[PDB]
From a paper:
Fibroblast growth factors and their receptors (FGFs and FGFRs) play a critical role in many physiological processes including embryogenesis, wound healing, inflammation and angiogenesis as well as adult tissue homeostasis. Compelling evidence also implicates activation of FGFRs ([name]–4) in pathogenesis of several developmental syndromes and a broad range of human malignancies. For the analyses of inhibitor sensitivity, we focused on a structurally well-defined kinase domain (KD) of [name], with the gatekeeper V561M variant and Y563C variant (corresponding to the replacement found in FGFR4) generated in the context of [name]. To extend the structural analysis, we solved the structures of the WT [name] KD without and with bound TKI258 and of [name] KD V561M variant with TKI258 at 2.3, 1.96 and 1.96 Å resolution respectively.
The structures of TKI258 bound WT [name] KD and [name] KD V561M superposes on apo WT [name] KD with an overall root mean square deviation (rmsd) value of 1.02 (287 amino acid residues) and 1.01 (286 amino acid residues) Å units, while the drug bound WT [name] KD and [name] KD V561M superpose on each other with an rmsd value of 0.36 Å units (293 amino acid residues). The low rmsd values and illustrated superimposed structures in Fig. 2B suggest that the binding of TKI258 to [name] KD does not alter the enzyme structure.
Author numbering: 462 to 485, 491 to 762
């Protein structure tokens, strides 16, 4: 056995957790008595756990994320820590559940049947989003990142795929507390859900692997492009191999078909080549708030 830290304010007895279906390892579950003021209320939650092939370092990473969430604290627009099971078995890290999945697939399923968006790959199409909904969506993500930035949390992989949507359509940033790998992990390597993380990385992160709040702001720019393409894929037809060269030479994605000039300028600002010139999430929140108000 190892020494998993018990933490009385967060510890939950395993019998109070009823395992549902898998999420992604992460699974859906029901928790009885989360608020131990209300011991008779079931809460639907997501449960982070190790894979069957997990290693000591993997265990250490999960604990790191858990402890990190404690220190970062709560915000409306992040996936919050709710509890943990460290005793009688496999480590379970309990977090907030977002029933409507990640933002990218959420947007794609809501594309109009037109053609100035790409095709709607969902067999279960939903109503589409108003112009104010989309800007309000960007606002929420910015607010979450503004909070994280204030807690000196650097995400290193902000993308629509890492933003979750609740039953009440609240945007929540996911996997912000993940640990940085001490080995030179290949970013050209495609992730399990087929995404190429490299396309969201700032130039300085690609070149010297320097990650900062400003590099997170770069990623938010790419995320902004994802939103107003309703889940579009970045740099269409550009080989990853040549992405850095092109960015250095000042290549930037073109304005999405349905996007205001103000919002595209915001993207561009986020994509400034000099990190110090990019806006801050604080500035981004302010500006987006004004824009939300004027979109209606
Ligand atoms: Cl992913
Ligand atoms: Cl992709
Ligand atoms: Cl697309």
């Amino acid at each position: 056995e190892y020494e998993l830290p018990e933490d009385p304010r967060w510890e939950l007895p395993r019998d109070r957790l009823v395992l549902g279906k898998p999420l992604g390892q992460v699974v859906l579950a029901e928790a009885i008595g989360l608020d131990k003021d209300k011991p008779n209320r079931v809460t639907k939650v997501a449960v982070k756990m190790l894979k069957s092939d997990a290693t000591e370092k993997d265990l250490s990473d999960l604990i790191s994320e858990m402890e990190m969430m404690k220190m970062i604290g709560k915000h409306k627009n992040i996936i919050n820590l709710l509890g943990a099971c460290t005793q009688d078995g496999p480590l379970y890290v309990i977090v907030e559940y977002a029933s409507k999945g990640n933002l990218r697939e959420y947007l794609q399923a809501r594309r109009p049947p037109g053609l100035e968006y790409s095709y709607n790959p969902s067999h279960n199409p939903e109503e589409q989003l108003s112009s104010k909904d989309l800007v309000s969506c960007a606002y929420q993500v910015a607010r979450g990142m503004e909070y994280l930035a204030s807690k000196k949390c650097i995400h290193r992989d902000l993308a629509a795929r890492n933003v979750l949507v609740t039953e009440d359509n609240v945007m929540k940033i996911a996997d912000f507390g993940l640990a940085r790998d001490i080995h030179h992990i290949d970013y050209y390597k495609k992730t399990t859900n087929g995404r190429l993380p490299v396309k969201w990385m700032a130039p300085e992160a690609l070149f010297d692997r320097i990650y900062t709040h400003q590099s997170d702001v770069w990623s938010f720019g790419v995320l902004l492009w994802e939103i107003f393409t309703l889940g579009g894929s970045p740099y269409p037809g550009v080989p990853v191999e040549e992405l850095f060269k092109l960015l250095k030479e000042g290549h930037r994605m073109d304005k999405p078909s349905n996007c205001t000039n103000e919002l595209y300028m915001m993207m561009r600002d986020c994509w400034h080549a000099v990190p110090s010139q990019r806006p801050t999430f604080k500035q981004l929140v302010e500006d987006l708030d004004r824009i939300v108000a004027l979109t209606s």
